[PDB]
């Protein structure tokens, strides 16, 4: 049939709504009103470590505190998009980054997202001092700029503490709210089944490309794995039998493949559905749910 | 000079394929096509010298002596100015309305020289000939020897000048009394037709539009395609003639012509095009009427290439990752050691062993001449497994294996695989896990270092006593015979046993009437590392990799094969130094024999994308992962509009992005905030209104941000207007249902079809 | 005929494995038009 | 194809290649064989639906005659500037030697040359009947076979 | 005359007539079932 003009539809329609998922997700930038923080502590309050550290020099920081802790505990191949031909002949065979350079003798293509740390540092950046107006009223048009410690404790009156607790013990929650952002950065190991998941992911990415190149060392119980071998020991009626093999190992794998990528790619997109309602009312509001 | 080149949007050139008509599809074809944009060969006629009253010495060009090479066939455009005015090329001042003119052609395998005009361009055998005559409306065909005349200027002369041919249509083309031989006249005074095997005619009707003619040539004949069949009005070439010429057509001749007409009816003569044929892979749009109305060279630049990976005409706005349709012909790279030569030397000279004792040559690190051997014998059977006869005098090997031993060939049923008898029993049982080959053959009598046995002799027996009757023992595949020390004291009768106690063997001989004939099984073993039993050769400088460095070359080192792109690296140390691997087995590197050490690759390595951009019909280039020194330097995977603007170095040049080497590209400094085409890293592209592609940036603004004044309360932004914004929104909730006829779509109502379905 | 039956009955497993997908796809899509109609159409959403 | 549709079916072309040739040497047109008969006299073309016939003519036709020696090419090359350059065959196609051939072998092993190629002939006798052999080769289409 | 995917779907005879190809098995048929009166009825769908 025509194999081959299916196979390249398929995974360009994959990658182009996986495009149009992360520009919805990131077109809250646009629209979103924020406040300014303060750099370190506001209030009695210490964001330090969600807060982006500013510097002299121009080389404008994109990660916090605790993302620059939680991407230091990931191993993920570094893909060289821009000249990443030329590093793996440099190198010889490092059999880490083995399926970053089995892209040039398998024939794939590993593709640069959508957008830079930078654009993705802004995201967050806006999800902190998001204004989001006040927590009495009803309607999503005005937008009322109180603090972020008057905040807190507007969420603590809306759960049953009555005014007068909050006004006596001010000191104590703003320390035990303090010791709480401080425990954040000791629940990156392997017993914490939340973060066992991020790894989890770049697994599942990598799995995917090492069983793409594996099924080319494969004979399939022809002579050998390789067409310029069956060429030069067989004739020209028994070539066809033995690349008939070889045909038709191969088409199995390009199928498995990218009937594979469609269910990760529609359930990434349910996936970031539910990180957009998880923010409207986790993040940018108060639950009332449990 | 008036250039016309192929235009593959209205399908120029292209020969409908043989078969059945389409309709409303787009497929791709193998074939021979003309390359687009190609200008072709532009032949040009005139008028003779003519006077009020006479016609006076024919003028033409240098066109006799030119030998142009056919190689795949041609296509001919034929009468493209008809009706329009032009010159009359004997007296470029005089214009005229423009003619058609059909060319004629003389085809041949072989070429010699005009003695004693000693001037070039003479087919010297059998010799086709392509001849229009009758004004226009008859076409001859015939292959016949030509032999060159003695008259005045007859071609067998000192004193003639080319040929040409004439016709004087004051006379010929009267109307109604068109003389259908006038041109074969006039080729008959040049030549005597001697030994014609063929001669065909074919008719034409006489208007002047535009038309396409082509020649081709394969194992049925010549083929000759024309426009003019089954309408004149297209672009088409259908099939209306096979010639029986069956040897190969090296060389051809276009034979010039100048109409004699008279001097006060001087006409003009529309020029023809030749556009040689290529083995080109094309995308084929055949409309409701069945005939090709568009085409697509998909070789030519990068918007073909994604065209025809696609396989659409209409390709929707986007950045697309595309496949490589170019040839780029290859070279070699042939490195093997030297050594001695392999002694077969224990095979032709003694007493061949009995079969049961048969003799064993292992050879290693050696050249091998399995001709030499071969041609010492008769062969009458040559059956092999997982290698051919023809590859095992040509491959390089780690190990070589022959049993040999003397064998009568009308037993030639009892050796093969699974036979019955006690040949595989007891004597010799063939192991078919290697490749092997097995040869029987006869010893004839000139080769007398070979003496003859007296008695052919096998084993019939081979047991231990046991309890309970006989314990037979069988052979192992490759494997000796146990009763082999039992055998050693000779078979001087039939049936004639033989026993140790422990086990007991009979034999049967019977005598040798005739030839000597023996039996060969060759077994051989393919690995990596440097296969050192290699055949012989003769050297060659040429095979080597220090000129070809960046380009596709066909390999052959060590007994390693394939094909790939060498570069220069500095790498790998240890002592495996010959051939460096990669996790899946890959040839990622070489040890040459010098002391380069060479990167290996594929043929196709590097990526390529197209950035398309359909309401300005816009397209660019894109080497992901590459920095822009390596594209010039590897400028031969690519499509042919590729190479010629990286070697020119003349554009807006190559440009180092964040994303790789970009073609057709230029540094903006605008921002955008929608894209339509992202190239990835907060990247996107400014399609030209400009000429040429920009490179913009996405950045996403921010509402103002609204700071806290330092007072008792706070400040709170409240609207003063609104409108109703809509948000359009579709929820999926069924699909279309199917049931399938499961035994009509698989079987399709055979028996035997659904007999075979029953073991699934 | 073994070669036209495998190439066969390969196409028909992979048509009957994609119905099921777009079947249970729809089936989860005409729930959530559910929660869409009773909550924006026949009353007002509290929620962005 | 079997033997038995070739006389059944409708084709839109039929080749039928034709020699004479001794059939104790039919293990030298097999596909795939060894010897000098595929190299520089004929190979088979296996791309189109083929069959390969070797016949004996017996004594009572009379309108075939028989040659005295059969004979076939060893050798067809040209010369280089380090020893020869052979020329193989293509399937279906004439030896490129094949004007150099015309000029008859009287005796085994008689070359000829035109100074850039060079041939090479074996002869030997023919005893018995007269042996022949035939390759067809079929061509279904579609449209009107 | 064929289709879009090479099929025999119609015919020019010798005499003056076309006509249609269609394959042996052509028309859909469906069987009603009830069960508890153990009945049935057919359905030749798409089918005047
Ligand atoms: C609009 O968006 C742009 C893209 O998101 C921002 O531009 C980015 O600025 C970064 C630094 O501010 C650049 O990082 C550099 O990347 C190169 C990669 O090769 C590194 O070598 C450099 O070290 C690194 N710079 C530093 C200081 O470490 C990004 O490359 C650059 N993006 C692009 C596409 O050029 C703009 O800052 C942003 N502008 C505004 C006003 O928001
Ligand atoms: C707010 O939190 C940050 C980070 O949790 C504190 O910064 C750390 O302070 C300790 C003790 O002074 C130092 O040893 C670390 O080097 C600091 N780390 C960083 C990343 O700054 C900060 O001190 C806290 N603020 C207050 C007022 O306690
Ligand atoms: C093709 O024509 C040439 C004529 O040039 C023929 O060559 C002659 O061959 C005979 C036979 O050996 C020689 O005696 C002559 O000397 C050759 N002619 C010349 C001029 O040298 C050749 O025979 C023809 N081809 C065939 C197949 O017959
Ligand atoms: C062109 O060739 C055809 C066929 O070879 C010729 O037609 C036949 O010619 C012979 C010889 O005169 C006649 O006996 C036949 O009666 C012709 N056949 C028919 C059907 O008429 C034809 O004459 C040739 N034409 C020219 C101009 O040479
Ligand atoms: C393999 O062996 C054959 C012998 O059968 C070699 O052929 C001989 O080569 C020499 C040197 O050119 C000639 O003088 C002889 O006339 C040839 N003999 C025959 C019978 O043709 C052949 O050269 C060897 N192959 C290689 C690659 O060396
Ligand atoms: C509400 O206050 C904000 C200040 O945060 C105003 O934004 C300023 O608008 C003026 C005039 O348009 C600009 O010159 C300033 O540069 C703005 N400042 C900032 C920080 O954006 C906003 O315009 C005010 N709203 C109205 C209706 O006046
Ligand atoms: C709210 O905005 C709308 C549109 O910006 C205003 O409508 C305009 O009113 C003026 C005066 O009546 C007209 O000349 C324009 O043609 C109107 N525009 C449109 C699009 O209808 C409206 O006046 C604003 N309301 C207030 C209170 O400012
Ligand atoms: C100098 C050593 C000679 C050894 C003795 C040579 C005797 C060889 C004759 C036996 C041939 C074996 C025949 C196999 C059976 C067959 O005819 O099929
Ligand atoms: C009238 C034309 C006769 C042409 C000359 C006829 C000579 C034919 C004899 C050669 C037969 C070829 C034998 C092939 C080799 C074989 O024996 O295997
Ligand atoms: C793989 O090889 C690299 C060097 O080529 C080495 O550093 C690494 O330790 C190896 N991997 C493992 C799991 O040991
Ligand atoms: C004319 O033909 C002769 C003979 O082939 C050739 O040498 C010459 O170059 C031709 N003239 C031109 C202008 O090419
Ligand atoms: C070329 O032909 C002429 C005859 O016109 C003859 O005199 C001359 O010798 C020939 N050239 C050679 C090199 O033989
Ligand atoms: C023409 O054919 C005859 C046989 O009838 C042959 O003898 C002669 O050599 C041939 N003519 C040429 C020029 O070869
Ligand atoms: C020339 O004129 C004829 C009739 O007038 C017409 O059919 C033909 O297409 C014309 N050719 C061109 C090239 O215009
Ligand atoms: C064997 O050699 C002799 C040498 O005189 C020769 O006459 C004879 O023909 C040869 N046998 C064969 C079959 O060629
Ligand atoms: C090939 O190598 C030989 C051996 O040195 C040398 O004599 C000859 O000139 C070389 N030829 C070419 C074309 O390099
Ligand atoms: C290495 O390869 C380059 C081609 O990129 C070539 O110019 C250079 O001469 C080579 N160096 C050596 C030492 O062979
Ligand atoms: C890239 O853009 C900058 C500023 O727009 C310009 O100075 C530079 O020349 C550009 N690079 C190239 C290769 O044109
Ligand atoms: C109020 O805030 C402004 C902000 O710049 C500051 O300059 C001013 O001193 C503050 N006044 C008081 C009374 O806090
Ligand atoms: C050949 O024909 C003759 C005619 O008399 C006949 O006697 C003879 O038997 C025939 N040969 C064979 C083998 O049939």
């Known amino acids: 049939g025509q194999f081959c003009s299916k196979i390249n539809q398929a995974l360009h329609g994959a990658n182009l709504r996986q495009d149009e998922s992360i520009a919805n997700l990131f077109s809250?930038?646009?629209?979103?009103?924020?406040?300014?923080?303060?750099?370190?502590?506001?209030?009695?309050?210490?964001?330090?470590?969600?807060?982006?550290?500013?510097?002299?020099?121009?080389?404008?920081?994109?990660?916090?505190?605790?993302?620059?802790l939680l991407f230091n505990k990931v191993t993920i191949a570094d893909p060289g998009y821009m000249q990443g031909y030329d590093e793996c002949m440099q190198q010889g065979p490092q059999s880490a980054r083995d399926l970053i350079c089995a892209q040039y003798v398998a024939g794939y293509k590993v593709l640069p997202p959508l957008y830079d740390p930078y654009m993705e540092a802004a995201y967050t950046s806006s999800l902190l001092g998001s204004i989001a107006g006040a927590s009495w009223t009803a309607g999503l048009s005005s937008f009322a700029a109180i603090p972020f410690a008057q905040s807190i404790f507007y969420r603590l009156n809306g759960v049953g503490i009555t005014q007068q607790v909050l006004s006596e013990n001010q000191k104590i929650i703003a320390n035990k709210f303090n010791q709480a952002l401080g425990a954040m950065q000791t629940g990156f190991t392997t017993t914490?089944?939340?973060?066992?998941?991020?790894?989890?992911?770049?697994?599942?990415?990598?799995?995917?490309?090492?069983?793409?190149?594996?099924?080319?060392?494969?004979?399939?119980?022809?002579?050998?794995?390789?067409?310029?071998?069956?060429?030069?020991?067989?004739?020209?009626?028994?070539?066809?039998?033995?690349?008939?093999?070889?045909?038709?190992?191969?088409?199995?794998?390009?199928?498995?493949?990218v009937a594979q990528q469609l269910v990760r790619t529609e359930a990434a997109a349910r996936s970031a559905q539910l990180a957009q309602d998880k923010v409207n009312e986790c993040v940018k509001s108060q639950s009332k749910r449990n | 000079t008036w250039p016309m080149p192929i235009d593959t949007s209205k399908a120029e050139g292209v020969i409908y394929p043989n078969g059945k008509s389409y309709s409303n599809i787009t497929l791709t074809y193998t074939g021979l096509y003309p390359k687009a944009n190609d200008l072709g060969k532009q032949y040009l006629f005139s008028d003779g010298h003519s006077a009020p009253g006479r016609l006076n010495n024919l003028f033409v060009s240098n066109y006799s002596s030119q030998v142009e090479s056919?190689?795949?066939?041609?296509?001919?455009?034929?009468?493209?100015?008809?009706?329009?005015?032009?010159?009359?090329?004997?007296?470029?001042?005089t214009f005229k309305p423009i003619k058609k003119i059909y060319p004629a052609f003389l085809l041949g395998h072989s070429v010699g020289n005009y003695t004693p005009s000693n001037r070039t361009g003479r087919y010297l055998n059998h010799t086709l000939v392509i001849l229009p005559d009758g004004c226009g409306t008859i076409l001859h065909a015939f292959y016949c020897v030509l032999h060159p005349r003695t008259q005045q200027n007859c071609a067998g002369e000192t004193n003639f000048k080319s040929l040409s041919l004439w016709d004087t249509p004051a006379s010929d083309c009267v109307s109604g009394s068109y003389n259908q031989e006038a041109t074969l006249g006039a080729f008959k005074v040049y030549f005597d037709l001697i030994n014609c095997t063929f001669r065909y005619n074919y008719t034409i009707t006489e208007d002047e539009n535009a038309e396409w003619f082509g020649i081709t040539q394969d194992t049925?004949?010549?083929?000759?395609?024309?426009?003019?069949?089954?309408?004149?009005?297209?672009?088409?070439?259908?099939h209306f003639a096979t010639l029986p010429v069956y040897q190969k057509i090296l060389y051809y001749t276009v034979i010039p012509r100048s109409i004699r007409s008279p001097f006060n009816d001087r006409k003009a003569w529309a020029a023809f095009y030749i556009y040689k044929l290529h083995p080109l892979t094309y995308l084929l749009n055949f409309d409701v009427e069945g005939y090709i109305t568009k085409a697509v060279d998909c070789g030519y630049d990068d918007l073909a290439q994604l065209q025809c990976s696609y396989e659409s005409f209409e390709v929707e706005t986007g950045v697309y990752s595309v496949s490589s349709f170019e040839a780029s012909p290859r070279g070699e790279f042939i490195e093997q050691a030297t050594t001695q030569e392999c002694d077969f030397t224990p095979m032709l000279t003694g007493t061949p062993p009995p079969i049961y004792n048969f003799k064993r040559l292992v050879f290693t690190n050696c050249n091998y001449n399995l001709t030499k051997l071969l041609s010492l014998f008769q062969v009458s059977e040559f059956?092999?497994?997982?290698?051919?006869?023809?590859?095992?005098?040509?491959?390089?090997?780690?190990?070589?294996?022959?049993?040999?031993?003397?064998?009568?060939?009308?037993?030639?049923?009892?050796?093969?695989?699974?036979?019955?008898?006690?040949?595989?029993?007891?004597?010799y049982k063939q192991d078919f896990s290697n490749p092997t080959c097995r040869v029987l053959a006869t010893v004839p009598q000139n080769l007398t270092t070979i003496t003859k046995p007296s008695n052919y002799a096998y084993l019939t027996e081979c047991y231990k006593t046991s309890a309970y009757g006989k314990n037979y023992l069988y052979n192992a595949p490759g494997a000796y015979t146990p009763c082999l020390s039992?055998?050693?004291?000779?078979?001087?009768?039939?049936?004639?046993?033989?026993?140790?106690?422990?086990?007991?063997?009979?034999?049967?001989?019977?005598?040798?009437?005739?030839?000597?004939?023996?039996?060969?099984?060759?077994?051989?073993?393919?690995?990596?590392?440097?296969?050192?039993?290699?055949?012989?050769q003769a050297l060659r400088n040429d095979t080597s990799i220090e000129d070809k460095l960046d380009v596709c070359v066909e390999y052959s080192l060590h007994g390693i094969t394939g094909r790939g792109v060498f570069h220069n690296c500095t790498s790998v140390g240890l002592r495996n130094q010959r051939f460096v691997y990669d996790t899946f087995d890959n040839l990622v590197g070489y040890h040459s024999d010098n002391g380069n050490y060479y990167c290996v690759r594929p043929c196709?390595?590097?990526?390529?994308?197209?950035?398309?951009?359909?309401?300005?019909?816009?397209?660019?280039?894109?080497?992901?992962?590459?920095?822009?020194?390596?594209?010039?330097?590897?400028?031969?995977?690519?499509?042919?509009?590729?190479?010629?603007?990286?070697?020119?170095?003349?554009?807006?040049?190559?440009?180092?992005?964040?994303?790789?080497?970009?073609?057709?590209?230029?540094?903006?400094?605008?921002?955008?905030?929608?894209?339509?085409?992202?190239?990835?890293?907060?990247?996107?592209?400014?399609?030209?209104?400009?000429?040429?592609?920009?490179?913009?940036?996405?950045?996403?603004?921010?509402?103002?941000?609204?700071?806290?004044?330092?007072?008792?309360?706070?400040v709170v932004a409240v609207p003063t207007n609104f409108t109703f914004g809509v948000t359009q929104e579709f929820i999926e909730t069924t699909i279309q249902k199917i049931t399938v006829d499961c035994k009509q779509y698989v079987c399709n109502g055979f028996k035997k079809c659904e007999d075979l379905l029953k073991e699934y």
């Open chain 1, 28 to 68: 809250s930038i646009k629209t979103q009103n924020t406040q300014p923080l303060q750099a370190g502590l506001n209030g009695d309050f210490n964001l330090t470590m969600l807060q982006i550290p500013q510097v002299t020099t121009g080389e404008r920081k994109y990660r916090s505190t605790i993302e620059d």
């Open chain 1, 192 to 257: 914490n089944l939340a973060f066992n998941k991020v790894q989890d992911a770049v697994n599942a990415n990598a799995m995917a490309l090492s069983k793409l190149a594996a099924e080319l060392s494969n004979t399939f119980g022809a002579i050998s794995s390789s067409i310029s071998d069956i060429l030069a020991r067989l004739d020209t009626v028994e070539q066809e039998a033995q690349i008939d093999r070889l045909i038709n190992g191969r088409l199995t794998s390009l199928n498995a493949f």
């Open chain 2, 70 to 93: 056919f190689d795949d066939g041609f296509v001919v455009r034929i009468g493209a100015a008809a009706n329009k005015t032009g010159t009359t090329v004997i007296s470029q001042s």
């Open chain 2, 220 to 238: 049925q004949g010549v083929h000759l395609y024309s426009s003019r069949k089954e309408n004149v009005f297209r672009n088409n070439m259908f």
């Open chain 2, 383 to 427: 059956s092999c497994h997982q290698v051919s006869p023809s590859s095992l005098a040509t491959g390089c090997y780690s190990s070589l294996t022959v049993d040999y031993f003397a064998y009568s060939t009308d037993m030639s049923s009892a050796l093969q695989p699974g036979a019955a008898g006690a040949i595989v029993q007891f004597n």
């Open chain 2, 486 to 536: 039992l055998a050693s004291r000779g078979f001087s009768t039939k049936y004639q046993s033989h026993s140790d106690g422990e086990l007991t063997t009979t034999g049967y001989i019977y005598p040798v009437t005739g030839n000597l004939q023996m039996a060969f099984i060759i077994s051989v073993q393919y690995g990596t590392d440097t296969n050192s039993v290699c055949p012989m």
């Open chain 2, 604 to 714: 196709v390595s590097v990526p390529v994308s197209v950035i398309y951009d359909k309401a300005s019909n816009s397209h660019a280039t894109l080497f992901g992962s590459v920095a822009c020194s390596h594209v010039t330097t590897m400028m031969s995977q690519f499509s042919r509009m590729t190479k010629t603007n990286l070697l020119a170095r003349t554009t807006p040049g190559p440009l180092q992005t964040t994303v790789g080497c970009a073609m057709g590209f230029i540094n903006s400094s605008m921002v955008v905030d929608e894209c339509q085409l992202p190239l990835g890293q907060s990247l996107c592209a400014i399609p030209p209104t400009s000429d040429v592609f920009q490179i913009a940036t996405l950045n996403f603004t921010s509402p103002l941000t609204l700071a806290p004044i330092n007072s008792t309360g706070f």
